[PDB]
């Protein structure tokens, strides 16, 4: 009954909230000033502290040194090099060569080393977040999930169960086969904890020469700096087919990066706390030198799940949608000659859309019939299957 009064007491006190907010100050929305009622910290001291007793210590690169006397050699970006000296106020040691340090603008002397170079383009793969997949819903890989987990997590989880026996754990593994190669990788990507990184190798084809190699090198650098890391490789078919080259120099930029990468695991003080898995579309024409033992230990495969895992998937991608409560899902798989669980979820979706088509809520056998026959035979013509059934 009190509509006008309630709405006006609503909006007028909202306007008063606005006015008292502005009394504080949220307007003058800036180009980089902190929240107006927050930055009052940097008022007198910090201001005249962060600046007056604080100097830049210009970023600086080392060259080499000499014993018994400081006499270090510096290198800087635009200015030349200088025979230089450090600061007593730091330990006289960790300013050795191949390192980035800070040096005041004026005295030209060292104060502190800085982390090695970064190239944030390479920082663009520290995935930082584990999504929400689980080995549960990826069934069928009954003798594959374990085959993975053993050479995937067990040593990290039990860095004793393989040690007292005095045997070294394996290192490398790759996937092949919409069989679920990426899905199985996502499931292994989440559940772990250590520093996980990946690179779509397609993001290495440059326009200059060698750049990809330098990037891969810095990647392995930050890897070795890490203490327990796992790298995943995605669809490296692009990273190089083979050195089949002939006459006219082509594709050479690729194979350069190829060999450079392939060095990065074999002999000559190898990685360490480092294992990996890649996956192909068509392994048919992948490099032999990668297949080499010590790089490519395991060969777990993703084929067509049989009907059993297929039945489990039929459970999986239907147990969260209104359906007939008494369907014989056996026949569903029975009319799934060759497919992926992706296609199972697809048939489910199509049936659901045919349900929401007119009115209903729960599903029927007939919905599944129309979903299958269409998805199967109407969508048969292309179906992308064969040339990968031969992996060619």
């Amino acid at each position: 009954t009190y509509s006008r009064q309630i709405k006006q007491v609503e909006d007028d006190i909202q306007q008063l909230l606005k006015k008292i907010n502005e009394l504080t100050g949220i307007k003058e929305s800036d180009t980089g000033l902190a929240p107006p009622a927050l930055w009052d910290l940097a008022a007198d001291k910090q201001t005249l502290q962060s600046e007056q007793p604080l100097q830049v210590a210009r970023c600086t690169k080392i060259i080499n040194a000499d014993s018994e006397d400081p006499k270090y050699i510096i290198n800087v970006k635009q200015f030349a090099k200088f025979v230089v000296d450090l600061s007593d106020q730091v330990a006289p040691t960790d300013i050795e060569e191949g390192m980035r340090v800070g040096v005041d603008r004026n005295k030209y002397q060292i104060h502190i080393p800085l982390p090695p170079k970064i190239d944030p383009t390479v920082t663009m793969m520290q995935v930082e977040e584990k999504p929400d997949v689980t080995y549960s819903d990826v069934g069928g890989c009954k003798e594959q999930i374990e085959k993975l987990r053993e050479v995937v997590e067990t040593p990290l989880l039990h860095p004793e169960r393989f040690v007292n026996l005095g045997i070294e754990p394996p290192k490398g593994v790759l996937l092949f086969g919409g069989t679920g190669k990426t899905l199985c990788a996502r499931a292994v990507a989440n559940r772990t904890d250590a520093c996980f990184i990946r690179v779509i190798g397609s993001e290495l084809v440059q326009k200059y020469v060698g750049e990809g190699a330098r990037m891969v090198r810095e990647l392995f650098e930050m890897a070795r700096t890490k203490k327990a890391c796992l790298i995943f490789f995605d669809e490296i078919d692009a990273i190089g087919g083979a050195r089949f080259d002939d006459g006219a120099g082509g594709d050479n930029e690729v194979q350069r990066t190829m060999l450079e990468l392939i060095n990065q695991l074999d002999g000559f003080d190898p990685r360490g706390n480092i294992k990996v898995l890649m996956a192909t579309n068509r392994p048919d024409t992948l490099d032999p030198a990668l297949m080499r033992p010590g790089r490519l230990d395991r060969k777990i495969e993703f084929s067509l799940p049989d009907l059993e895992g297929r039945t489990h998937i039929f459970k999986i991608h239907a147990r969260s949608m209104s359906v007939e409560r008494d369907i014989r899902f056996e026949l569903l798989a029975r009319l799934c000659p060759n497919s992926t669980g992706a296609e199972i979820r697809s048939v489910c979706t199509e049936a659901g859309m045919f349900a929401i088509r007119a009115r209903r809520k729960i599903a029927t056998e007939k919905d599944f019939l129309e979903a299958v026959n269409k998805v199967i035979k109407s969508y048969a013509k292309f179906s992308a299957t064969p040339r990968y059934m031969t992996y060619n």
């Binding site: 609503e10 909202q14 902190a34 910290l41 800070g102 990426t182 326009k207 669809e235 489910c348």
Partner: protein, 384 residues
Amino acid sequence: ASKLPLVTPHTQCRLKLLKLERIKDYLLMEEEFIRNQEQMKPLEEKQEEERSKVDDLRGTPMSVGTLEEIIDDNHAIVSTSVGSEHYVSILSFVDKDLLEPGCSVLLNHKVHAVIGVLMDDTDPLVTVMKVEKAPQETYADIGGLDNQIQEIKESVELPLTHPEYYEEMGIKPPKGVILYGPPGTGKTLLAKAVANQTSATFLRVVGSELIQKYLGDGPKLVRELFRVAEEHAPSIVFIDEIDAIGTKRYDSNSGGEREIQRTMLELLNQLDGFDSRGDVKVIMATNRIETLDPALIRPGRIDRKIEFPLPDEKTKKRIFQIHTSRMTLADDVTLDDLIMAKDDLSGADIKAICTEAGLMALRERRMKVTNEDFKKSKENVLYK
């Protein structure tokens, strides 16, 4: 604003107004605290004072910053226009939140300390596909098939406007959408009407332009493009005629398939990224679908797959009606004896004949379009 989203009754009960007057009480109390702090203790104006001292400290010549690294101990390394970097400090008043490598920052003059940041005038590339306005009319203007059309309606418009129906169904909507048919049937125009109805972000670009005379860029272009698209809003991007990149070859291209393959590969990946797929749905439109890489046609990447047929003559009459409604034609219009000329003509041919006949009228400044004009029209437009 954005005080409390619990205004659930939307009725004339005690709930709403009680919320309102209690927020009134707390607001009066906090405002009076803000008052009483200055009452005995003004100690400054703090309107433009806490800002005056900032301006004082913040270096008068605003030095273009360029973020490359982050040591958030209120001091990180920044560079210069030519890259004469140093290890300047940062301050509290900078809201150290959006710090990112490759950012427009503000540097002090003397010690080059971080005055602040700057927003990005963007983008000399987004605008090129950033949709301006509703370009065309309703689907009702198209007509002719309207069934698979309704299918696309369901697959695209229905989701956003009914984010409940699939929910009672308990299923997220499909992922992929695609058209295919002969040259001139309704794959781009249809998209036009789609956008006409929409209230979401929209872009347009052609696969043909994906190739670059250099090496490797096009892929990265695809990457960052998908990124930017995903970053914005409810959005559906579309590419027309990808098969172009898989059919021809331009000698200006540096290499050949040696980039086609990789680019298309990364492309296909970027629609099935293990990472957050985000709020994106994609349509397709190609003339030669049979010959492109079937790998893209994988279920999950592409879901709704719809044919585009030859419209029927009885509908060709409707197309005639379409492109003849709002023109002051002559009475002699016997459209049927004009429909059957090309036994497999296209809905574009209607517009063709119509506008051509109109031109014929304009040449002689006439108004109503007579039949012999249709004759000459069919003769010109088709016989070559």
